[PDB]
């Protein structure tokens, strides 16, 4: 019955800077508030309990304060391993509910994607379906738009896309987009194109091929 | 050293039941409270249930009350979760979490989690298709791992020897109910006529292992 | 029904004392997850397996804002009161 809300949803800061994360309770939870860190693909780790106490093995650049309905987690001098998702959790009242999480990502300079297009393989085509893949490699920030065109007609509803986590070394994202057609449809058209819009590109970039 | 190991996850059809267990070691299991927490893919942490150190006290999230039962066997250091009448919305990684005290949060140690998928799809190994490199100094190539079920798959390049410049993307759920993911690498153009590139795909739910050579 | 309050999180606010009317009274504070039922018991010294607390407050609880008062009767002789992990030696007059 107690709603925990975190803010902001995403914080972008540079290595060595300070990150301040907020956790709000809809009613007082006294000091019974914990923070957790979760890195992509790992279980959560307890950071803070009792609102301000560091858990064992947690380094001093993590500190936290607050009581009642407002809590803050501050990460001073952000290091590479600090960039993750953070959850708060109130445990003053059953049931002990989590906030929805704040993602802390690395803020870097704008970087345009390098764009590559792949036709369906002959192996897949002998199967009756054709997937066309568009890769946007190593761009920042994460927001990017991919628009598929087939013989210069804009497609919709027949593509899906996924984005990697932020790269450890250069703090970029990559994105993969798949356009799926039936073999019969794929053989009715000639030009397959991926059009990419991104902050680092002064105008949309198109990569295409001609079937056959 | 505290360890928590969950098991019992897998695919289960909606309406049916599944029991998870969590094997604890490296501490006196019978002294502390134990919880289950779950996490749907891409979503947040979601507390499920608690059981006190002595098993007298239990409590459940509203979303699972009447359908789930938490229990424990202190003589065997094991925590259980009986999940009946499962729904699609119960699909999640289920984590085993320890309390530092008799029952309350917070959760000082967590297991790695076990994946529950509530679905009618049948287990299926992927088809792996080459993403061949072709027409500044660097070439991209990869593998399309298509039409498998359930998660997860793993992908390497050259049996782990090739890690630099690899991007293995999160899988997407297609309208068929099967997943599809791509794994790509960027290499020097000059290596295409020299170095062999093989993607190693392992889909443990279906006992599928595939190695696909990706060739200009 | 409530879970049993976490037995590690009690402190005395009023230690066991004579009520005036032939009962033992006390007050605790609780710093854990609420609401919950207070684990309270007592034993004769040297006889740890037999509860001797006769509770006048029959289902004492910590509520979301109140609770913590406990009243009981004890048999004559040397006893030990427990509230969670909290323990207090107590002589009961005949």
Automatic annotation (TrEMBL), chain C:
Disulfide bonds: 5-36
Record's subcellular location: Host cytoplasm, Host perinuclear region; Host endoplasmic reticulum membrane; Host nucleus; Secreted
Origin superkingdom: Viruses
Coiled-coil ranges from the UniProt annotation: none
Known role: Binds to host cell surface receptor and mediates fusion between viral and cellular membranes. Envelope protein is synthesized in the endoplasmic reticulum in the form of heterodimer with protein prM. They play a role in virion budding in the ER, and the newly formed immature particle is covered with 60 spikes composed of heterodimer between precursor prM and envelope protein E. The virion is transported to the Golgi apparatus where the low pH causes dissociation of PrM-E heterodimers and formation of E homodimers. prM-E cleavage is inefficient, and many virions are only partially matured.
Subunit structure: Homodimer; in the endoplasmic reticulum and Golgi. Interacts with protein prM. Interacts with non-structural protein 1. Homodimer; Homohexamer when secreted. Interacts with envelope protein E.
UniProt protein name: Genome polyprotein
Species of the source: Tick-borne encephalitis virus
